[PDB]
Amino acid sequence: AGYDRHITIFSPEGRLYQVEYAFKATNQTNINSLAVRGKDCTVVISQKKVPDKLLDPTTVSYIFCISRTIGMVVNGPIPDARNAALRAKAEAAEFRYKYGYDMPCDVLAKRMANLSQIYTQRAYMRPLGVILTFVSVDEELGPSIYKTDPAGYYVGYKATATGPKQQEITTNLENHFKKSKIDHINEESWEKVVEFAITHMIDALGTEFSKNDLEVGVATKDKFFTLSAENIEERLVAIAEQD
Amino acid sequence: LDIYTCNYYFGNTTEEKLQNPNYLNVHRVRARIGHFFHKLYVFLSTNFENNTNMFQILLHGLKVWFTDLGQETVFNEDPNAFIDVDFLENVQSLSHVNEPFTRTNFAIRANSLHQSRVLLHSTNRKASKLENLLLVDIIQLATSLYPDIYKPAQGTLVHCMKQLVGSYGVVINKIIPSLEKAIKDHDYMKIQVILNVLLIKKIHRKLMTDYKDIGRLIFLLIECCRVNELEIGMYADKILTDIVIGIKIPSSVCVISDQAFLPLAPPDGTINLQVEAVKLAKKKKREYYLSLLVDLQDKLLDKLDNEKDMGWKIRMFILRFVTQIQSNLESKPDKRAVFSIISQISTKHPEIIHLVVKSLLSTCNKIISLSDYEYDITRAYKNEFNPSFVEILDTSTTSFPKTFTEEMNNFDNPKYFIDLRAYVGWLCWGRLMYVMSPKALKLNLRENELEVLKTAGHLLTREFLRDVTMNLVQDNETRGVFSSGNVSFFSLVILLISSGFCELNMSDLFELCESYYNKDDKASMIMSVEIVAGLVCGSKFMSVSDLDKRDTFIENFLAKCLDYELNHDAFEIWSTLAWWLPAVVDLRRSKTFFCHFINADGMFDRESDAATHQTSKIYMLRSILMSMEFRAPDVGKLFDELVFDHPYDQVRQAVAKLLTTLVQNQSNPSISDPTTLLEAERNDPDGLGLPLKSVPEKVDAYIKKQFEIIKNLEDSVVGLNPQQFIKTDYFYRTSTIFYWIKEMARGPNKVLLVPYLVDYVLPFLIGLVKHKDVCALASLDPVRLYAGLGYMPIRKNHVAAIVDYVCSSNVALSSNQTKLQLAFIQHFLSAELLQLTEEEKNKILEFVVSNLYNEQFVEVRVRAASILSDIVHNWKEEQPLLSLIERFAKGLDVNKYTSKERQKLSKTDIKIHGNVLGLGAIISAFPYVFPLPPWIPKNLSNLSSWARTSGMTGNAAKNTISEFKKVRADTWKFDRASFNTEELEDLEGVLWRSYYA
Amino acid sequence: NVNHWTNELKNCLHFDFPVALRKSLATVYYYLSLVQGQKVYRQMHVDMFERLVSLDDDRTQFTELLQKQGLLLDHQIMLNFLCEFLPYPDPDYARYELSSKEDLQLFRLLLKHAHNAKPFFDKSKESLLVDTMNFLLSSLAPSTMMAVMPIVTSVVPYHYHIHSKIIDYFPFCYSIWSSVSANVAIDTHMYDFVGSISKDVHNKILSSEHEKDVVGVEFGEFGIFTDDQMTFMFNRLQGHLRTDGQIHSYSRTVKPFVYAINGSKKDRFFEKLVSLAKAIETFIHPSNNGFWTKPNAKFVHAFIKSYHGRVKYEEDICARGVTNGICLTSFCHEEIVEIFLNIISLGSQNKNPDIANYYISCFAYLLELDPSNAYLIYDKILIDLYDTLADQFINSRHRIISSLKQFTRVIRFIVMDKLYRVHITNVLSMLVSKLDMNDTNLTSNLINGIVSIAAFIPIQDLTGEDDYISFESDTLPLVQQHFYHIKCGESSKTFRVDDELLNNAFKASTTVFQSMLKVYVEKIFQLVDVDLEDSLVTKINQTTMILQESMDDKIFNYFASLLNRNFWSNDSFKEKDPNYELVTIPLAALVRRNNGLSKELVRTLLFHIKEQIKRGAGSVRSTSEIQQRDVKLVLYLTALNDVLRNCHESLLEYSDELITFMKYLYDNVTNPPLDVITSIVIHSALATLCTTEITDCRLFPEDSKIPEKDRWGGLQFDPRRFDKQHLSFQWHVPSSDEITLSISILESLSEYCINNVEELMKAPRHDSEYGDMIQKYVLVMTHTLSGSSLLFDPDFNKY
């Protein structure tokens, strides 16, 4: 009867009810993330929220290392994020083996988006409640930032944000690439690009951060790594001593 | 002037407003806005033709400027910040209670009244020079080529004709000229658009009233019937066809009780000369209109006669002169039309031909109706139904009832005919009775009408009926079909024939008929028999010497056709005639036709030959006798001639289906007076009425015989078997009688069948221990009929004798036909519940219960209990009830006997099988008592120590506890608590089948 | 032209006129409807007649007053028409055949018209009755069955004479009936007859003239019916509900049974009704659906409409001195509840929600009879509801939604009985907090409850500062004790409480309104982001606007600083495409009641809209969609529209600051989907100055227009509910000052648009940020013409 609300088929106005709902799930964690391009780096900041005093912060991560070169940050329930990370960690290992070069940021995204699409067209499987933000310093395109969503869509951003206060963060960035009129952040060392990404997020969220409320992921050529508890405090100390 | 009044601020039409600076200020500003929208329109259509978004925003700015004048109608209904009057009304109004409203509601209710006083103000006006300029623009837009523009403009030009006066005129005198253009400027999509306009509700409607312009328009839509290239021409046909269905004109003096205008007649003296003046102009306004159509009529017949060949929209014309050369309220029957309408038979096209007939038959039934009305066109709509050949008859006449009866049997010297459905009589006499005269006349008409009919019979050659019926047969091969439209056309040829105009002699339709009878071609036979039905509807047409040439041809023809050699294809047709003809003509207009089917050389009697043949009659004689039901039915013969003994089924069944019908014809109670009648109904035993339809003694005698003739023959099967049974006379009778009962219990004959049940029909039927296997053979379901007679139109006094027949003290007579009478009761009860006197409601229950105990049949002790519950469901009074419970649980209660014994008893003792079956039914008669009665636990407890015993009773006591634990399923979360008794445990065994261990 | 005037007349019935002129008018339309020979808009004329003869034109009955005022109409004309529908010999002429819509549809109209003019057939032509039957009867035969029967039921007048009465003709109906088995093609006419006739006798017996030539028609046990006549119709109705399902519109089929009850000789009838309920019992059960579940429902409702129907017509007559022992007693109302209570309770849980809404709506009809039984119903409904709010039905969907419908169709009555009313604060603050954001349906059925409780209750602190107060200590303890009692089998009659304690409970119960609205507003902003849509978006705004009007200044002035507060500081307009309606409109409704609140609310929407424009909002072009970076600017702009529209005269203060901001909003901000919004500012401000509308809707006025504080059930039953001092509505009437600003604007924006557009007629065909600007000015111009629409005169061009 009224069961086009429960599976991935067409409502009478060409709508996929289950996908629209799947999107609504990406906020359910209540973390926000943003990503930027440098002259030759890429940065992803996410929030870390550890309410339970019984937790171990070191195990609480929405930033995944997919390959030597490629990083991914998810907005969405942890279960679904891992289902996607595991699948990408493997699509990119297979890609290197079959084809002989490391797997490129934008190709991994097209491949997860294609995947995210099948869910969108097959009755029996459900999309995942995640929005995958992929970053790297791809050997042909430079700093890359490519985001896929439960709809099957992927596209590449100068910078981007995702989650609950997504549009407050987004509109901050827009007003800073209207002003430097380019496609990146003209700073050499990634450190200053991480400070900038934290700055423009404090500004946009109107709250300060401590070494414990952030997760930072960084991509340079030949590596993608994540910053430690302390590697961040350093970044914050430097913001505070100029602002 | 002003009656609406809405606080218009600038004073309510006082021209307290005209002397207001603030009011010339305001309109001087709407003028600028108007002249500015035109400034912008011209600036766009010139600089931006290829844009839709601009023109939409302008077209809404005009939907506003033209409408939002007194009121606010776009935006009118958006949810705003006022509580909705319609919502609040639902919340607060109770019905049958005057305005029980809270203060909040009264307040919107009042605001809602103001707001409706504003919208009342009719905004309808005269076009304002500038307003005409903008309406012309709104047309060039609804005449634009972009659907994204012309569709909102059209919707926008309609909100604008609601607002201007005779604006439809402005619109048409712009459309037509710029459609005539777009045609001589070729295949334009501006033609496609102009046609879309002509299909707008408000325009397409005012079209059937524009007599001036619809002249020119139809000829434009015709030129348009050429898809020179598009969806055009498909649209031009839908439109020209829509047109034929509107229009007309009313001359006829409103048959008005002059009291429809008098009560409002002003004192004013002859200042109501005005009325007799209007009467005169709305009378030449009319007569001009009426002439414009005749001018269009003749100007088309021009383009149809003279246009060597236009193709198949040859059809608009014909589809139209027809709803015209036969309208009346004027319409001068043109003879050049009747010529042209017929000379279109030369296109030998199925659709055209079907219509030439449909038209020629109406174009006459109109001229005919001028003679019958004596040119008093008014006389149609006056229910003093003129026709010179109709005659009223007084029915109260002490003597009448036996004129009818002895005049319906009269076929040679017939005094009156009722063509159609004969109502008067049947119930009672007394009314006046509209009837028809013998050897009906033709009547006279003036010369104009005369030369028109001449121009048909001079065109209905031996050759033209040849061409036209041939065709009707071939278009007919696909379908089958009959259409009276065909027959009511042949009666017409007959009127024309021997009234003077055709001269074809009837002996020409006898060949044309004998001609189309190929025992092979079905659609060809259907034409032959369509012809016959015409010759019998052609007695509304003189010559007693032709009505004898026709009575003679018909007894000769029905011979060739029906007297042996008859396929399920003919039978399919003729049998169609029998159900129809007697309803469109009194059959006494023919001595031979009826007195032919009733000539019954068809019903043999025994089988050591091939018996013979068929219902090569029966089912056709019957379907005539069914359609008269009243008239002609003198059948002294048939009753003395029926069979019953017949070996074949197809006949045994048919002799029954016929008698059924023969009985419904002598059962009409037609009484002398309404008064004589109601005095019979008043004095009836049941505070109710007379049995409607009551079988007349001389027949109650016949039937009784057929049942007691079958009781005579019970020696005939003294001991034979199923194979030597179907061959005895006792079976043959019995089978026929059965097929008859089956057909009485169906339909309007039930009230006839009742008196016989108690003595005849139920003693019979239960002719079933008269062999179960004999029924399986000649597939008869008695069980299903006997019991299906539990429901039916029984009357207060008949119930008595029926309950007494069941619950018989002779009961003990039958055997497992016992579980039969017991199922008939279960059904009676459901259809006579609430109608049974607590006396009867008991004679039943004491029978049912006397069966929970009958030694021998275990089969029935159970069917009894299942039924005892149907009773105890409507039995809420607590002392009839609680006094049963006790009667039953005395045969068991406590450990009357120790364990070893229960085992022994449970297997054999009947007095205890009953007691547990019975007490079981009681509990299963209260399925959902939402909070549970404490007599149920305490009495399942008495039943549980017994469902713990394997045997025959201990089994039907497990039934009772599982049946129960099941239906209580969803209410069980709760029922658990009224079982203190750890005899909750005591209910766990209970259900056991082979798959549990 | 006829048809036009026949309408402007229709328009004239809205005021009054002399019964002596109705005599005239009716006579015109009786004979007019029956014209023949031309195109006639009959439906209109039979409707004039039917409205001129209305039997309830605001409690006034014009058929009585027209009988008394000497109206008499020809029956031969009517019957002569209805008889063209009989078999006219010679088929070539028969004009009317049933079966074929176009014809049956006329017949159904004539028949309706006759029913209308049945009472104006000469009561005095003694041989009009007998003459007419002795004719129809002779016309009856199987082939006429269909056309005759209906005629009789609508063209023969209910006469009653010394020798020939109309009930004289009954024994003949129970001759046809009782001869065919259940057949709706027949029955429907029998019930319509013996019923509209039994209704008649009853009506006539009371108050008026107990006669019409014969009070020689005795009532007794079973109305005007024999013992066997009644007996028969009972087992026939049982036949319909259990076997043959043959009935249509049941209102008509039920009449005979209702109007055969005799208040002083019921008993024998109620005995017959009970056994009919005990038969029908199983077929209502929620899990026995079939061909019957419709008939039983449409009947159990049709019967309790048509009973309460009668009662409220008699209680209108014992407000005229005349009891009559035929009348329905307090003890009939009792045995009616006894019968249909399990029956109604089973039906309301039925699987079909429409077939349930029938059984559930019967609770309201029964409670209006204020029977001694009343408690039995309130007892069920309140347990079923309290269980549901305690999640004891969570496994079964229907019980939850059902027992919330039971409770809604009955809220208004609970606010009365001085015991139950206590519960109503609790049950409301419970519904509000249980408003789900995932279950669209549960929420629609909760708002139903919430808005019904607000429609009949004043949100007011009724505490005289009495110290013991508090919701716990004083209300809760009692509510739980009542519930414990009710749950354990006991009823509310057995429930004894001190009139002192029970009035502490009631007054202390009116404290929670504050802490509960903080929770409704919270639930509103959560709903701004849900794909609830339309029907239910509206219904929610009704609940927010009704809740406002039932609020005293103390509470309202709180609610206001709580929308104001939450509207600004909220984290609740994210998700794609929001329901701004649910929050902007409830603001407008604050300004309706308190214009004072506008001066500052508007100036804050403007220094917050200029803020969003200045920081890039509506910078990025798109038809089709509202950019999500705009969503905030769009909130503030909808609010400004919705809130100007209800500003009225308080807008005179900041006139110049508005106009100059509107011109700013159109200089900056171009974007086709924002311009359909910004251009509405001009309308919501012109409409607000010169549109004449209401302003006050409060349940109870001023804060002080004391009927006292026994003022709960909103006077919905008190006869003071409508004396003029209560209904002291406010109304905005446009003053000379407002019209004058009104016009200042019209010309100032009218010029602004025409200039900026006459400028752009130095044509850039490219731009496209050009066609955006011309559309803008043409929308601003347009919405400048509307709202500002009340100052124009249709007729101006004549003058």
Coordinates of C-alpha atoms in Angstrom, one line a residue, chain A:
Chain A
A1 CA 0.0 0.0 0.0
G2 CA 1.7 3.1 1.3
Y3 CA 5.0 1.2 1.2
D4 CA 7.1 3.4 -1.1
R5 CA 8.3 5.0 2.1
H6 CA 10.1 1.9 3.2
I7 CA 12.1 0.7 0.3
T8 CA 14.4 2.3 -2.4
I9 CA 11.6 2.9 -5.0
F10 CA 9.9 5.8 -6.6
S11 CA 7.3 7.9 -4.8
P12 CA 4.7 9.4 -7.1
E13 CA 6.7 12.6 -7.4
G14 CA 9.9 10.9 -8.4
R15 CA 11.3 10.9 -4.9
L16 CA 13.3 8.3 -3.1
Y17 CA 12.0 8.5 0.4
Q18 CA 14.5 6.2 2.0
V19 CA 17.5 8.1 0.7
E20 CA 16.2 11.4 2.0
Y21 CA 15.8 9.8 5.3
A22 CA 19.3 8.2 5.1
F23 CA 20.7 11.7 4.8
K24 CA 18.9 12.7 8.0
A25 CA 21.0 10.1 9.8
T26 CA 24.3 11.7 9.1
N27 CA 23.6 14.3 11.7
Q28 CA 22.6 11.7 14.4
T29 CA 26.2 11.8 15.7
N30 CA 26.2 15.6 16.1
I31 CA 29.8 16.1 15.0
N32 CA 30.8 18.8 12.4
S33 CA 33.7 18.5 9.9
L34 CA 35.5 20.8 7.4
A35 CA 38.2 20.2 4.8
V36 CA 40.6 22.6 3.0
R37 CA 43.3 22.7 0.3
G38 CA 46.8 24.1 0.8
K39 CA 49.5 25.0 -1.7
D40 CA 50.4 21.3 -1.3
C41 CA 48.4 19.8 1.6
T42 CA 44.9 18.9 2.6
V43 CA 43.3 19.2 6.1
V44 CA 40.3 17.7 7.7
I45 CA 39.1 18.8 11.2
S46 CA 36.3 16.9 12.9
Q47 CA 34.8 17.2 16.4
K48 CA 35.5 14.6 19.0
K49 CA 32.7 14.2 21.5
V50 CA 33.5 11.9 24.5
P51 CA 30.6 12.2 27.0
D52 CA 31.1 8.9 28.8
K53 CA 34.0 9.2 31.3
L54 CA 34.3 5.4 30.9
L55 CA 35.4 5.8 27.2
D56 CA 38.9 5.7 25.9
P57 CA 39.3 8.8 23.6
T58 CA 42.0 7.0 21.6
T59 CA 39.5 4.5 20.3
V60 CA 36.9 7.2 19.4
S61 CA 37.6 8.3 15.8
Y62 CA 35.5 9.3 12.8
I63 CA 38.7 9.8 10.8
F64 CA 39.9 6.7 8.9
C65 CA 43.3 6.1 7.2
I66 CA 42.3 4.4 3.9
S67 CA 45.7 4.1 2.3
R68 CA 49.2 5.6 2.4
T69 CA 47.9 8.5 0.4
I70 CA 44.1 8.7 1.1
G71 CA 42.2 9.9 4.1
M72 CA 38.5 9.7 4.9
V73 CA 36.3 11.4 7.4
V74 CA 32.7 10.3 8.0
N75 CA 29.6 12.0 9.3
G76 CA 27.3 9.3 10.5
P77 CA 26.6 6.5 13.0
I78 CA 29.8 4.7 13.8
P79 CA 28.6 1.3 12.5
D80 CA 27.9 2.6 9.0
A81 CA 31.1 4.6 8.9
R82 CA 33.2 1.4 9.5
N83 CA 31.3 -0.6 7.0
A84 CA 32.3 2.0 4.4
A85 CA 35.8 2.5 5.5
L86 CA 36.5 -1.2 5.5
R87 CA 35.1 -1.4 2.0
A88 CA 37.2 1.5 0.8
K89 CA 40.4 0.3 2.5
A90 CA 39.9 -2.7 0.3
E91 CA 38.8 -1.2 -3.0
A92 CA 42.0 0.8 -2.9
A93 CA 44.3 -2.1 -2.0
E94 CA 42.7 -4.0 -4.8
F95 CA 43.1 -1.0 -7.1
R96 CA 46.8 -0.8 -6.5
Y97 CA 47.3 -4.5 -7.1
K98 CA 45.2 -4.8 -10.3
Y99 CA 46.3 -1.6 -12.0
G100 CA 49.8 -0.8 -10.7
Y101 CA 49.5 2.7 -9.3
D102 CA 48.3 3.9 -5.9
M103 CA 44.5 4.6 -5.9
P104 CA 43.7 8.3 -6.6
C105 CA 41.3 10.3 -4.4
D106 CA 38.7 11.0 -7.0
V107 CA 38.5 7.5 -8.3
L108 CA 37.9 6.0 -4.9
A109 CA 35.1 8.5 -4.5
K110 CA 33.5 7.7 -7.8
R111 CA 33.7 4.0 -6.8
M112 CA 32.0 4.5 -3.4
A113 CA 29.4 6.7 -4.9
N114 CA 28.7 4.2 -7.6
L115 CA 28.3 1.8 -4.7
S116 CA 26.2 4.2 -2.7
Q117 CA 24.0 4.3 -5.9
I118 CA 23.2 0.6 -6.1
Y119 CA 21.7 0.9 -2.6
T120 CA 19.6 3.6 -4.2
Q121 CA 18.2 1.3 -6.9
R122 CA 18.0 -2.1 -5.3
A123 CA 15.0 -3.0 -3.2
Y124 CA 16.7 -5.2 -0.6
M125 CA 19.8 -3.2 0.4
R126 CA 19.7 0.0 2.3
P127 CA 22.0 3.0 1.8
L128 CA 24.3 4.0 4.6
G129 CA 23.7 6.9 6.8
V130 CA 27.1 8.4 6.1
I131 CA 28.7 11.2 4.2
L132 CA 32.2 10.3 3.2
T133 CA 34.6 13.1 2.8
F134 CA 37.8 11.9 1.0
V135 CA 41.1 13.8 1.0
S136 CA 44.6 13.2 -0.4
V137 CA 47.4 14.9 -2.2
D138 CA 46.8 13.0 -5.5
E139 CA 49.9 12.8 -7.7
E140 CA 48.1 14.2 -10.8
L141 CA 45.5 16.7 -9.4
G142 CA 47.1 18.1 -6.3
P143 CA 45.3 18.5 -3.1
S144 CA 42.0 16.7 -3.5
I145 CA 38.7 16.8 -1.5
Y146 CA 35.9 14.6 -2.8
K147 CA 32.6 13.9 -0.9
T148 CA 30.0 11.2 -1.6
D149 CA 26.6 11.0 -0.1
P150 CA 23.8 8.4 0.4
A151 CA 22.2 9.7 -2.8
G152 CA 25.1 8.4 -5.0
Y153 CA 26.4 11.8 -5.7
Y154 CA 30.0 12.8 -5.6
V155 CA 31.8 16.0 -6.5
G156 CA 35.1 17.8 -5.7
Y157 CA 35.3 20.8 -3.4
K158 CA 37.7 23.7 -2.9
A159 CA 36.8 23.2 0.7
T160 CA 33.7 21.7 2.3
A161 CA 31.8 21.1 5.5
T162 CA 29.2 18.5 6.7
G163 CA 26.9 17.8 9.5
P164 CA 24.4 19.7 11.8
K165 CA 25.8 23.2 11.8
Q166 CA 27.0 22.5 8.2
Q167 CA 25.7 25.8 6.7
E168 CA 27.1 28.0 9.3
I169 CA 30.6 26.6 8.6
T170 CA 30.0 26.5 4.8
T171 CA 29.0 30.2 4.6
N172 CA 32.1 31.1 6.5
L173 CA 34.3 29.4 3.9
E174 CA 32.4 30.8 1.0
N175 CA 33.1 34.4 2.3
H176 CA 36.9 33.7 2.3
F177 CA 37.2 32.4 -1.2
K178 CA 35.0 35.2 -2.5
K179 CA 37.8 37.3 -0.9
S180 CA 41.0 35.6 -1.9
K181 CA 39.3 34.7 -5.2
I182 CA 41.2 31.4 -5.6
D183 CA 40.7 27.6 -5.1
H184 CA 42.9 27.2 -2.1
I185 CA 44.7 28.4 1.1
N186 CA 48.0 30.1 0.1
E187 CA 50.2 28.7 3.0
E188 CA 53.2 26.4 2.6
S189 CA 53.5 24.4 5.8
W190 CA 50.5 22.3 6.6
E191 CA 50.7 23.5 10.2
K192 CA 49.4 26.9 9.2
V193 CA 46.7 25.4 7.1
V194 CA 45.5 23.3 10.1
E195 CA 45.6 26.4 12.3
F196 CA 43.5 28.2 9.7
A197 CA 41.0 25.3 9.5
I198 CA 40.5 25.4 13.3
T199 CA 40.3 29.2 13.3
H200 CA 37.6 29.4 10.7
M201 CA 35.6 26.8 12.6
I202 CA 35.9 28.4 16.0
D203 CA 34.7 31.6 14.3
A204 CA 31.8 29.8 12.7
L205 CA 30.7 27.7 15.7
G206 CA 31.2 30.4 18.3
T207 CA 32.9 28.0 20.8
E208 CA 36.5 27.5 21.7
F209 CA 38.2 24.0 21.4
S210 CA 40.6 22.1 23.7
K211 CA 43.1 19.5 22.6
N212 CA 40.3 16.9 23.4
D213 CA 37.4 18.3 21.3
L214 CA 39.1 17.9 17.9
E215 CA 40.3 15.3 15.6
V216 CA 42.7 16.4 12.9
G217 CA 43.7 14.6 9.7
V218 CA 46.3 15.8 7.3
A219 CA 47.4 14.8 3.8
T220 CA 50.8 15.7 2.4
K221 CA 52.4 14.2 -0.7
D222 CA 53.4 10.6 0.0
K223 CA 51.6 10.4 3.4
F224 CA 48.2 10.8 5.2
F225 CA 48.5 10.8 9.0
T226 CA 46.5 12.0 12.0
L227 CA 47.5 14.5 14.6
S228 CA 48.0 13.2 18.2
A229 CA 46.5 14.7 21.3
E230 CA 49.6 16.9 21.6
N231 CA 50.2 17.7 18.0
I232 CA 46.9 19.7 18.2
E233 CA 47.5 21.5 21.5
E234 CA 50.5 22.9 19.7
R235 CA 48.3 24.1 16.9
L236 CA 45.9 25.7 19.4
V237 CA 48.6 27.4 21.4
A238 CA 49.8 29.1 18.2
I239 CA 46.3 30.3 17.3
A240 CA 45.8 31.8 20.8
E241 CA 49.2 33.7 20.6
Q242 CA 48.2 35.9 17.6
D243 CA 44.5 36.1 18.1

